[PDB]
Amino acid sequence: AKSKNHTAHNQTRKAHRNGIKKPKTYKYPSLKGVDPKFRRNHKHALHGTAKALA
Amino acid sequence: VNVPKTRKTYCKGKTCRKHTQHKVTQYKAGKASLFAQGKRRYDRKQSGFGGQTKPVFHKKAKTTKKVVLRLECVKCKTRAQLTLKRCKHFELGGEKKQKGQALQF
Amino acid sequence: NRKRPVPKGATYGKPTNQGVNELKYQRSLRATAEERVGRRAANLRVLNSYWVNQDSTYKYFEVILVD
Amino acid sequence: SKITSSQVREHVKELLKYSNETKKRNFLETVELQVGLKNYDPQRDKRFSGSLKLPNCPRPNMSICIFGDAFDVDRAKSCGVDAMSVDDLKKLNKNKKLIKKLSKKYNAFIASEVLIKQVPRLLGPQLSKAGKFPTPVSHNDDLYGKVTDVRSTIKFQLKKVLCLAVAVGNVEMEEDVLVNQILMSVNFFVSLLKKNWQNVGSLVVKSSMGPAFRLY
Amino acid sequence: TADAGSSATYPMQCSALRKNGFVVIKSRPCKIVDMSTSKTGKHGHAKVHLVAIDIFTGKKLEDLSPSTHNMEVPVVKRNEYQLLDIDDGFLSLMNMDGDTKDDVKAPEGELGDSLQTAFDEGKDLMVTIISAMGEEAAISFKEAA
RNA sequence: GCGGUUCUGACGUGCAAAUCGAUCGUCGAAUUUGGGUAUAGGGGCGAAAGACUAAUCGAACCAUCUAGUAGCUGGUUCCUG
RNA sequence: AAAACAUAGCAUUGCGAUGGUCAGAAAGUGAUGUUGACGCAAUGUGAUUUCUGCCCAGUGCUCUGAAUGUCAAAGUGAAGA
RNA sequence: UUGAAGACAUUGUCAGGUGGGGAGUUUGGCUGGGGCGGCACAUCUGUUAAACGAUAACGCAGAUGUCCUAAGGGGGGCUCAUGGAGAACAGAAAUCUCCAGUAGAACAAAAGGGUAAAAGCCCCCUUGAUUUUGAUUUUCAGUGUGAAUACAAACCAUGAAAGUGUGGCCUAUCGAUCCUUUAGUCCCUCGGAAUUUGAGGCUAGAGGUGCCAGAAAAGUUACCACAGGGAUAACUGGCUUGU
Ligand SMILES: C[C@@H]1C[C@@H]([C@H](O)CC2CC(=O)NC(=O)C2)C(=O)[C@@H](C)C1
Ligand SMILES: [K+]
Ligand SMILES: [K+]
Ligand SMILES: [K+]
Ligand SMILES: [K+]
Ligand SMILES: [K+]
Ligand SMILES: [K+]
Ligand SMILES: [K+]
Ligand SMILES: [K+]
Ligand SMILES: [K+]
Ligand SMILES: [K+]
Ligand SMILES: [K+]
Ligand SMILES: [K+]
Ligand SMILES: [K+]
Ligand SMILES: [K+]
Ligand SMILES: [K+]
Ligand SMILES: [K+]
Ligand SMILES: [K+]
Ligand SMILES: [K+]
Ligand SMILES: [K+]
Ligand SMILES: [K+]
Ligand SMILES: [Mg+2]
Ligand SMILES: [Mg+2]
Ligand SMILES: [Mg+2]
Ligand SMILES: [Mg+2]
Ligand SMILES: [Mg+2]
Ligand SMILES: [Mg+2]
Ligand SMILES: [Mg+2]
Ligand SMILES: [Mg+2]
Ligand SMILES: [Mg+2]
Ligand SMILES: [Mg+2]
Ligand SMILES: [Mg+2]
Ligand SMILES: [Mg+2]
Ligand SMILES: [Mg+2]
Ligand SMILES: [Mg+2]
Ligand SMILES: [Mg+2]
Ligand SMILES: [Mg+2]
Ligand SMILES: [Mg+2]
Ligand SMILES: [Mg+2]
Ligand SMILES: [Mg+2]
Ligand SMILES: [Mg+2]
Ligand SMILES: [Mg+2]
Ligand SMILES: [Mg+2]
Ligand SMILES: [Mg+2]
Ligand SMILES: [Mg+2]
Ligand SMILES: [Zn+2]
């Protein structure tokens, strides 16, 4: 027989039990999707700075 | 759809690795071998009693196939494949469109 | 061959087992021969046997027995 | 391909040697391809029809006539090709004879795409029967180029006979060009037959009046 | 040579078909001359009975199907051509543009006899030809303007 | 004697898992019937009702495979925090 | 319990025994058959009287009908170590 | 023993046909009961939708299974619908000219958005509708498929150039495993050792599942069976009162 199709009733209450957690931030995010030409150079730049604080 | 019998496009061949002229044909499947391992297994499975031992497709829906082009490089002879979208009519080096002509009666 | 001895070829099961013709007994005609001789002369012991002849309908064997 | 190029080259060389050295004639000999068919019932199988253009003219100096409007008549005159307008074709009130004579004069006909519809009525089935029905030309097409194409076109078309003869080249042409044209002609022909290489019974090359050479 | 590899038969639902449409029966293209639908029993599932005449042979063909089952409908072209000649058995046709078709075979019965009598005197006969599933035939002819 | 029409009678936890009463069909043959004998389960037998085949028939009975499978029904045993 | 079945009557079909119809796992095996077309077997219609129209496209059944369409295994030919 | 018959037939094995006589099995889903119908089953536009996003009904108005070697890419020149006023035949409508013209046109195909020295119209040159793999957005489980976005490494096209271009101005136009087949590397394997065929692998495609995350599938039952269902029809009752 026919039934209910859809509702969001009760869904915000479920969502707020274990809260809506903001996603958590770090110093130093991933260089993921950053332009490869930039990344390739940036390796070379960081190499030299190590060989210099030594 | 109408596509030209030649095409300058990239050639992967190790003596090219550059755009070269290609002859363009249509791909045709190829005759199924009797000693392809799947065919040999099917033959063994079908032998004896038990009737049809594997599915047999009936519920055809499509009315087209995708066209595949065999591009052969005219220098090195390396081949490449390009899939076109579905179409009902396909021709290779057909007569090109004239613009601005009287559609005859 | 051994025709499956089932009434009117009805097998009463899945299609793999609908065979009646083209089935074959797992012992040789030679073994049938020894067995039928063995039963006729139950005081004897079948030692061995050998082929002597055949036509379309029959194969012929000789069976060696010991008392 | 059941023909290896080497055998064609040998027979072409022998043919050219015979035509140039043994009996040089007072006319340019055309090289032809004679083709036989196996396992074809013309009356019941589908009568294939294919036309190909050979790069170098097999028979330059083939007589062409243009049926054209005023604009095509003027272009035809500039190209040195015999133009007959309509007025003309109409003045010929048929005369099985007058038509027959025209039919046999030129080896082929090229008509303008407007008049051609009109050709069957103004002439008869006479042209259709000889297989000389006109090839179309457009105003937007190069009139002389079309003439270059007709001269350079070969047409295999089964009617009733398992025998076909087709002009592939001339004796003045380079050996390699002639070999390429023969190969192209055979390959095109095979790819018109239902069983590809199995409908081919025999393939024979010849000059206009020279001897024969059997590839297959 | 190069062809798309398209079907020559689009599917339709049996209930969708009509009188004077087309349909494939036992791998033959046919025109539908009678379509009837019946209930199969007390559950009231519908069944279709087709009677169709073959478009080439003229032969009669019956088929049965569930109303919602899919029937293959043939693709049917109907091109007209100018008649140039009857060479022997065959016709010789011109394709409007100017190209020629000389492989159509020419009709048998009352049409083929009518077409001979038409062509023998000076009339420009247009000739419609139906194509279906690797087959062609002439069906009717007219006169020119 | 064989049957079983109607009362839609009795009875309907019965005298009875089909009986009782009256009324009724047939009553010298395609008649009724004892005993012997044959036909056995996808089988028989059927003047044909899917009838009958030991109160069992649109596939008997007995045992086993078998604790057959069940997305379905029912149940599922002490206390407090 | 009937208007159903049967029935006499009517009509059709198959078959001359190296046979028709039917049985059996098989058999040097069976039923018809202690039979032989005025018979056996398979169907339909259903006393008498009277009549039994038209349609062979479909499905079926059937044919000393054409052939060179389709066309298995074995066999044959060629290519190939 | 006597007739017939004779290497035929019979019998055996394999092969093709025939074979509801018989066997086994199947005969979607959603659904204001079910069935018939339809597709609300894979999808796209506008609205319903309550000005973030999400959002139902067999809600409303519609569309998809294609089409295109240009209708793709680049550049140039130009300006459209319509109206007015003029020009032999010529008229409401033919072609030519001027003026006005914010788009009232066109842009394959629904609808919405977008576009004027263009994204429209015409012309020139072309194949970025290419190669190599990664990241990202939508749908979302933050899986797949489809579609799309921005880069990288190449190689190209166009243009004086800056640039633009990885198909179609944007929003739809489509397909796993197994099997077959093709392209690529001409590379790995055939396990006693080799060579050559054959077969098998690795990387990238195609053959298709529309019930579109993808069984191989016809009915009937009033002779019917079982498990269940008041999740669901055929009475009363109840709400409603169109009729
Ligand atoms: C219709 C055909 C076959 C089909 C497919 O091989 C069917 C298979 C699928 C599977 O995984 N197992 C099976 O037993 C049947 C496919 O791919 C298509 C493109 C081409
Ligand atoms: K439900
Ligand atoms: K629901
Ligand atoms: K069994
Ligand atoms: K088996
Ligand atoms: K099994
Ligand atoms: K039975
Ligand atoms: K009993
Ligand atoms: K049973
Ligand atoms: K369930
Ligand atoms: K009858
Ligand atoms: K009939
Ligand atoms: K008939
Ligand atoms: K024999
Ligand atoms: K058989
Ligand atoms: K059957
Ligand atoms: K309903
Ligand atoms: K995705
Ligand atoms: K599904
Ligand atoms: K059933
Ligand atoms: K009221
Ligand atoms: Mg729910
Ligand atoms: Mg829903
Ligand atoms: Mg085997
Ligand atoms: Mg087998
Ligand atoms: Mg009584
Ligand atoms: Mg009573
Ligand atoms: Mg009482
Ligand atoms: Mg009954
Ligand atoms: Mg239990
Ligand atoms: Mg149990
Ligand atoms: Mg009674
Ligand atoms: Mg009766
Ligand atoms: Mg009577
Ligand atoms: Mg064979
Ligand atoms: Mg059955
Ligand atoms: Mg349902
Ligand atoms: Mg979904
Ligand atoms: Mg919103
Ligand atoms: Mg565009
Ligand atoms: Mg994701
Ligand atoms: Mg999609
Ligand atoms: Mg080994
Ligand atoms: Mg799904
Ligand atoms: Mg309820
Ligand atoms: Zn190359």
The DSSP line for chain D is --S-HHHHHHHHHHHHHIIIII---SSPPEEEEEEEESS--TTTS---EEEEE-SS-SSTT--EEEE--HHHHHHHHHTT-EEE-HHHHHHS--THHHHHHHHHHSSEEEEETTTTTHHHHHS-THHHHHT-PPEEE-TTS-HHHHHHHHHTEEEEE-SS-SEEEEEEEETTS-HHHHHHHHHHHHHHHHTTSTTGGGSEEEEEEEESSS-EEE--
Q: Smallest Cα–Cα separation from B4: which of B82, B63, B75?
A: B82
E84 touches chain D (CB under 8 A): yes
Ligand 1 and B54: CB distance under 6 A: yes
Ligand 1 and B55: CB distance under 6 A: yes
Q: Give, in order, the Cα–Cα distances in Å from B72 to each of A32, B69, D25, D88, E5.
A: 39, 10, 44, 52, 21
Ligand 1 and B65: CB distance under 6 A: no
- Residues C27, C21 contacting (CB under 8 angstroms): no
Q: Give, in order, the Cα–Cα distances in Å from E24 to each of C15, E10, E41, E67, E132.
A: 33, 10, 27, 16, 10
- Residues E61, E53 contacting (CB under 8 angstroms): yes
CA dist D80 and D144 (Å) reads 9
Chain D residue numbers with beta carbons less than 8 Å from the beta carbon of E125 are: none
E87 touches chain D (CB under 8 A): yes
Q: Which of E6, E11, E96 sits opposite B88 (nearest CB)?
A: E6
Chain D residue numbers with beta carbons less than 8 Å from the beta carbon of E89 are: 43
Q: Any idea what the Cα angle at residue E144 is, between residues B95 and D95, rounded to 5°?
A: 95
CA dist D48 and D35 (Å) reads 14
Experimentally determined by: cryo-EM
Q: Which of B39, B42, B56, B57 to mutate to test the pocket of ligand 1 (most atoms within 8 A of CB)?
A: B57
Query: Do at least 3 CB pairs under 8 Å connect C with B?
Result: yes
Length of chain E: 145
Task: Round and report the angstrom distance from CA (B97) to C1' (H107).
Answer: 19
Best interface-test mutation with B: which of C6, C16, C20 has the largest number of B CBs within 10 A?
C16
Q: Is the CB of C66 under 7 A from strand F?
A: no
What is the amino acid identity at position D33? L
Q: What element of type H or E holds C39?
A: helix C29-40
Name the region of B24 (left: φ>0; alpha: ψ -120 to 50; beta: rest): beta
Best interface-test mutation with D: which of E92, E125, E127 has the largest number of D CBs within 10 A?
E92
Pairing of strands E22-24, E70-74: unpaired
Structure-block tokens of residue D126:
């006479």
Structure-block tokens of residue B103:
């559609």
Asked whether the beta carbons of residue D160 and residue E97 sit closer than 8 angstroms, the reply is no
D188 touches chain E (CB under 8 A): no
Q: Smallest Cα–Cα separation from D199: which of D39, D12, D84?
A: D39
**Start-to-end Cα distance in chain C:** 33
Residues having C-beta closer than 5 Å to ion ligand 6: C 14, 16
Which residue on chain E is closest to B61 by alpha carbon? Answer: E11
What residues pair up with E92 in beta bridges, in sequence order? E85
Which residue on chain C is closest to B52 by alpha carbon? Answer: C15
CA dist D43 and D148 (Å) reads 34
Ligand 1 and B62: CB distance under 6 A: no
Q: Give, in order, the Cα–Cα distances in Å from C16 to each of A7, C2, C20, C53.
A: 52, 17, 11, 36
Q: What is the DSSP letter of A26?
A: -
CA dist D121 and D127 (Å) reads 11
The chains in contact with chain C, meaning 3 or more Cβ pairs closer than 8 Å, are B
Length of chain A: 54
Contacts 24+ apart (CB under 8 A), C38-42: C38/C63, C38/C65, C41/C65
Q: Any idea what the Cα angle at residue D115 is, between residues D109 and D121, rounded to 5°?
A: 90
CA dist D133 and D65 (Å) reads 12
Q: What nucleotide is nearest B33 when CA is compared to C1'?
A: H180
Q: Is the CB of C7 under 7 A from strand F?
A: yes
What is the amino acid identity at position B8? K
Asked whether the beta carbons of residue D111 and residue E94 sit closer than 8 angstroms, the reply is no
| Shortest Cα–Cα distance, C7 to chain B (Å) | 18
- Residues E138, E115 contacting (CB under 8 angstroms): yes
E59 CA → ligand 12 middle, Å: 13
State CA D4 to chain mean position distance: 25
- Decide: residue E136, CB within 10 A, 0-12 exposed, 13-18 middle, 19+ buried: middle
B28-B29-B31-B37 Cα dihedral, nearest 10 degrees: 160
Q: Which atom of ligand 1 lies nearest, measured to the CA of B57? A: 1
A34 CA → ligand 18 middle, Å: 21
Nearest CA to ligand 1 atom 20: B57
Sheet of D30-37, strands arranged across: D163-170, D30-37, D200-207, D212-214
Q: Is the CB of C52 under 7 A from strand F?
A: no
Query: CB-hemisphere CA count at 13 Å for D139?
Result: 8
**Backbone phi and psi for residue B54, each to the nearest 5 degrees, phi listed first:** -140, 155
Query: Among chain B residues 25 through 84, which have CB within 7 angstroms of nucleic chain H?
Result: 27, 29-33, 35-39, 42, 51-66, 68, 70, 78-84
**Backbone phi and psi for residue B73, each to the nearest 5 degrees, phi listed first:** -70, 130
What is the full DSSP assignment across D99-153? Answer: HHHHHHHSSEEEEETTTTTHHHHHS-THHHHHT-PPEEE-TTS-HHHHHHHHHTE
Task: Round and report the angstrom distance from CA (D136) to C1' (G37).
Answer: 82
